[PDB]
């Protein structure tokens, strides 16, 4: 315990392994330590480290935070095998500035700390507004199809889909920078909804199982095609493909032949349960040498996030549809939901990613809350609400206290 | 001898160690000075700092260097990593807030 | 009010003129008398015993 070996980072990127005294105060080592790295750099033929104007030499963690000059290396949480960084930090002393007349003072000061509107942002605002507009247009046109079988809904939606997609193409080909692409991506993604309901609305007669087969299919196809030629915004499109594909299977089954919805819902639940274990493998196979590795790593990470998201949506819809406060053994699906939630709540630790772990953790909580609400809306009585209210507040309270205490 | 003598006057425990080895002068990185050469032969001048250490027979040193842009290594430490308890508390608070 | 508005603007340009002169003074005085904690790093520079 009398000494510790650590790697010290120096100028332009050289890493050097050194054996330091574990108890002397850090301020005593920084000077001779600097000499050693300069000697090796000079023999290596590289440019040595130098001071610039006013400043000082400091020893910091890889995060940049400097170590307190009077404390011992063992007093701080530094262990053998860690790495540190030697750095020069410039002087911040300068004259103070004062303004007497409050009007000019407020104006000058307030203009430095905040960002004003500019033409780059202006376009993104408009692009977002047009996207919101058309998803509203398809909504009312769709609501009309739910009461009338005439061609109007498909006819008018078809032309809108064509126009939006047409405009998106010019933007995509003409783009030059990431800002331009953001505008283009927002535009293209907005075309999927009109095109989707335009096909689904074509089959005559009352709406139901037969139309559903067309809708989720073209949706899945469009999402898959877009992902191929765009190669960007991986996570969200992947989620649409998964939820679209599984719904098409259920729609086709129900349309062809199904003894009960519970049968389909139970089948979907089982499919989702096994898919979670397959998710990391699927994501990994879906994906100067350094460029290839980094590109590969982030692409893989993105697919898993999307893949996890799609499954999360399906399980809550199925689970909440399977449970029921009146049908048979009312307690059987409730406890089954509990056992199902426990796996997701526990398995969340197997992934290092923050959003991936958080979404997994959140997926369990929403199911419990959703089940209680379902059992509170129906079979309505003072006992039901009184019990549900208490449960919903106690559930997370116990969870956070056990973690923070 | 004089260092141990001075330590006792300061009330500090003298230098002591166990195992096969020897006592010698070393640099801040642990590299020992040459036992057969003059301090004038070595690059030593007034105001330098040195350490007295026990060199056990088991001692081995890496003696190797590598290059990587320091600006990128520092950035990657935060660009993506594992969860933190502070974030967990924030998430817990939001959930109970959602519950009520 | 028109005379008031002109008078206020004339002062601001004097303020800006004063500020530039002050910055030249800060830059010069710091160059000759640094804060005591920064002196150690300067030992190798030609500024010593100047």
């Amino acid at each position: 315990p009398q000494a510790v070996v650590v790697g010290v980072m120096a100028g332009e990127g050289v890493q050097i392994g050194v054996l330091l005294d574990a108890n002397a105060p850090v301020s005593v080592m920084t000077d001779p330590l600097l000499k050693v790295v300069n000697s090796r750099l000079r023999e290596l033929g590289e440019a040595p480290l130098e001071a610039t104007g006013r400043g000082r030499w400091a020893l910091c963690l890889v995060d940049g935070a400097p170590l307190r000059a009077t404390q011992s290396l063992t007093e701080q949480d530094v262990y053998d095998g860690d790495r540190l960084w030697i750095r020069f930090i410039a002087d911040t002393e300068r004259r103070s500035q004062v303004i007497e007349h409050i009007s000019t003072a407020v104006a000058s000061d307030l203009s430095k700390r905040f960002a004003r509107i500019d033409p780059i942002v202006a376009v993104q605002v408009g692009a977002s507004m047009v996207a919101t507009g058309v998803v509203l247009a398809t909504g009312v046109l769709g609501w009309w199809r739910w009461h009338h079988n005439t061609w109007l809904t498909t006819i008018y939606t078809a032309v809108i889909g064509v126009l939006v997609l047409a405009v998106a193409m010019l933007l995509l080909m003409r783009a030059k920078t990431d800002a331009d692409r953001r505008v283009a991506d927002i535009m293209l993604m907005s075309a999927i909804m009109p095109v989707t309901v335009a096909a689904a609305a074509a089959p005559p007669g009352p709406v139901g199982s037969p139309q559903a087969v067309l809708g989720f299919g073209v949706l899945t196809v469009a999402a898959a095609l877009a992902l191929r030629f765009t190669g960007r915004r991986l996570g969200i499109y992947t989620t649409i493909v998964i939820i679209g594909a599984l719904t098409m299977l259920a729609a086709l089954a129900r349309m062809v032949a199904a003894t009960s919805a519970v049968t389909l819902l139970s089948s979907l639940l089982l499919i989702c349960v096994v898919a979670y274990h397959a998710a990391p493998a699927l994501s990994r196979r879906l994906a100067s040498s350094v460029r290839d590795v980094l590109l590969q790593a982030e692409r893989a990470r993105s697919f898993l996030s999307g893949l996890l998201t799609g499954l999360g949506v399906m399980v809550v819809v199925c689970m909440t549809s399977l449970c029921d406060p009146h049908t048979g053994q009312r307690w059987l699906p409730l406890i089954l939901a509990g056992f199902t939630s426990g796996f997701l709540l526990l398995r969340g630790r197997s992934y290092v990613d923050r959003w991936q772990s958080i979404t997994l953790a959140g997926t369990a909580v929403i199911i419990a809350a959703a089940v209680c609400v379902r059992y509170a809306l129906e079979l309505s009585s003072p006992l039901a609400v009184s019990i549900v209210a208490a449960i919903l507040v106690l559930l997370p309270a116990a969870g956070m206290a056990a973690a923070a205490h | 001898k004089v260092v141990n003598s001075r330590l006792r006057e300061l009330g500090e425990a003298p230098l002591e160690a166990t195992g096969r080895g020897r006592w010698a002068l070393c640099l801040v990185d642990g590299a020992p000075l040459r036992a057969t050469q003059s301090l004038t032969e070595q690059d030593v001048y007034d105001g330098d700092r040195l350490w007295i250490r026990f060199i056990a027979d088991t001692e081995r040193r890496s003696q190797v260097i590598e290059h990587i842009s320091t600006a990128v290594a520092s950035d990657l430490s935060k660009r993506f990593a594992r969860i933190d308890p502070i974030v967990a508390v924030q998430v817990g608070a939001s959930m109970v807030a959602t519950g009520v | 009010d028109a005379m008031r508005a002109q008078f206020m603007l004339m002062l601001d340009m004097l303020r800006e003129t004063a500020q530039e002169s002050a910055d030249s003074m800060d830059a010069n005085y710091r160059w000759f008398h640094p804060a005591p904690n920064t002196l150690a790093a300067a030992v190798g520079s030609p500024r010593m015993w100047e």
Partner: peptide, 18 residues
């Protein structure tokens, strides 16, 4: 400045002569 800081500065300066 502290005593340590003074000795630290003094050691750095002692290395040089005319």
């Amino acid at each position: 400045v502290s005593i340590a800081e003074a000795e630290e500065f003094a050691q750095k300066l002692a290395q040089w002569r005319l």
